[PDB]
Each structure stands twice: as structure tokens, then as C-alpha cells.
Amino acid sequence: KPEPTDEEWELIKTVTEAHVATNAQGWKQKRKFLPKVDLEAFSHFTKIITPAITRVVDFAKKLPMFCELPCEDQIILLKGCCMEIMSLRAAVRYDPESETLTLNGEMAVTRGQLKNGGLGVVSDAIFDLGMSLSSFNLDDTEVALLQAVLLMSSDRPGLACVERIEKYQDSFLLAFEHYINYRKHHVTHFWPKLLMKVTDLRMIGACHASRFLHMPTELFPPLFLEVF
Amino acid sequence: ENALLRYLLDK
Numbered sequence: 106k107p108e109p110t111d112e113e114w115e116l117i118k119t120v121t122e123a124h125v126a127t128n129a130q131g132w133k134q135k136r137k138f139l140p141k142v143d144l145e146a147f148s149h150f151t152k153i154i155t156p157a158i159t160r161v162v163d164f165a166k167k168l169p170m171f172c173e174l175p176c177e178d179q180i181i182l183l184k185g186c187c188m189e190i191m192s193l194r195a196a197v198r199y200d201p202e203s204e205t206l207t208l209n210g211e212m213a214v215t216r217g218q219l220k221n222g223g224l225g226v227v228s229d230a231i232f233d234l235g236m237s238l239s240s241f242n243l244d245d246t247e248v249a250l251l252q253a254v255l256l257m258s259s260d261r262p263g264l265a266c267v268e269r270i271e272k273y274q275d276s277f278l279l280a281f282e283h284y285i286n287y288r289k290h291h292v293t294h295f296w297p298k299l300l301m302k303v304t305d306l307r308m309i310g311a312c313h314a315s316r317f318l319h320m321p322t323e324l325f326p327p328l329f330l331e332v333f
Numbered sequence: 334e335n336a337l338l339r340y341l342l343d344k
């Protein structure tokens with residue numbers, strides 16, 4: 106089973122570090138269990154959205170490949186994957202004992218809070234992912250690599266460098282699988298099942314976008330509105 | 334129009 110090359114070991118070091126550097130309190134100790142849909146639920150959530158969006162922006166910037174694209178491309182790639190990444194980042198922090206996700210490394214939310222907080226069915230999707238990601242035992246390199254795959258998505262509307270972006274994603278995909286091969290998880294068909302999680306995360310990002318077409322806008326943090 | 338994003342990306 107092919108294990109990672111040396112150029113790939115360096116790409117794994119690059120992405121892991123950029124992720125660790127932009128991941129809140131890498132946190133179970135520094136927790137804060139929170140208590141038609143109440144805009145009072147919005148307050149706690151929209152107030153924590155901007156610091157989360159920013160961390161994704163910071164992860165992106167710390168990948169050279171990302172910095173080599175034209176700004177209008179960087180904007181489109183960040184719009185398209187921000188919720189996908191914030192969502193992976195909460196899902197790997199699912200605690201089966203409390204049945205909670207940890208947002209921003211501190212706030213512990215439940216299925217019910219996130220849903221009635223305005224996320225709706227997307228809440229069930231993210232909890233379901235976290236539950237099903239428990240047995241995967243993804244480490245910081247695996248998560249960072251999933252993030253780079255979502256970030257470097259060639260099919261986002263308006264992109265100029267479709268060909269370059271695709272070439273970068275192929276790169277991360279090969280490092281990711283060779284690292285997966287190296288790690289020998291005690292789970293069957295590990296690589297296939299991960300690619301299925303990537304589709305689960307991309308459904309979360311497409312449904313969030315669609316659910317943001319709801320009526321005022323000034324009530325919503327300004328960076329949240331700029332990443333729909 | 335992606336003014337805050339644009340800022341956070343150039344800085």
C-alpha cells in the first residue's frame with residue numbers, strides 16, 4: 106500500500122501546521138455548555154461566526170498554493186468552503202458523552218440548540234457526521250488534508266484558474282491517501298469512506314448557502330454576509 | 334462587495 110513520498114511529507118507538514126495554527130485551543134477543558142426560531146438563538150451564534158470564518162481565512166492564507174491564485178479566485182474558493190470547514194471542525198469535536206459539538210474551541214452546543222438556533226436540518230447533518238467520524242480517529246494531519254481538498258475545489262462558479270486549482274487538489278488527494286495508507290486505521294475501506302465524508306461535507310455547504318436566502322441583513326455579522 | 338474578505342486576504 107503506497108505510503109507518502111518526501112515532497113508529500115513536506116506538503117503534509119505545510120497543511121498540518123497551517124491547520125493547527127488556525128484551530129481554536131487545540132479545548133475540551135476550556136468548554137462552556139450553552140443553557141418561528143428565536144433570533145435570541147442567532148445572537149450567541151452570529152457573534153461566534155466571525156471569529157470562525159476568520160480562522161478559515163487564516164488557514165487558507167498559510168497554504169502557499171492558495172496565495173498563488175488571483176484574489177477573485179481566493180474569494181470564490183473561501184466562499185465555497187468556509188461552512189464546509191467550520192462544519193468539519195465542529196464535527197471532529199463531537200463528544201458522544203455530552204452529545205455536543207464544540208464551536209470555537211469553547212462553546213458546547215447540542216443538536217437542538219444548533220437547529221432551533223436557525224441551522225435547521227443542516228444541524229442533523231453535522232451531528233450525524235460527527236457521530237460517524239468518531240470511529241475514524243482523524244488526527245490533525247487528516248483533518249487539515251480534508252480542509253485542503255474542500256478549499257481547492259475546481260467546480261465553484263466563476264473560477265478563473267480551474268486547471269491550476271484542480272492540479273493542487275489532485276496533489277492533496279494523493280498525499281492524503283498515501284498518509285491514510287501509512288496510518289493503517291482499523292476501519293474497512295478507509296479511503297473510499299473518507300471520499301464519502303467529503304461529499305457529506307459538500308452537501309452541508311450547499312444547503313447552508315441555500316438556507317441563507319431567508320429575509321433584516323443588518324442583524325447578521327458583516328463577514329458572515331460576505332461569505333453567504 | 335467582498336470588501337471585508339478582500340481586506341482580510343490582502344493583509
Ligand SMILES: CCOc1nc(C(=O)NCC(=O)O)c(O)c2ccc(Oc3c(C)cc(C(=O)c4cc(C)cc(C)c4)cc3C)cc12
Nearest residue numbers: 129150157160191192194195208209222223313316317319
Ligand atoms: C456547526 C458547524 O459549523 C460551525 N462551526 C464552528 C466551528 O467550530 N468552527 C471551528 C473553526 O473554524 O475553528 C462555529 O463556530 C460555528 C458557528 C455558528 C454556526 O452556525 C450558524 C448558525 C447557527 C446560524 C447561521 C445563520 O445566521 C443562518 C444560517 C442559515 C443556513 C439559515 C438561516 C435562516 C440563518 C449561520 C451559521 C453558520 C456554525 C458553526
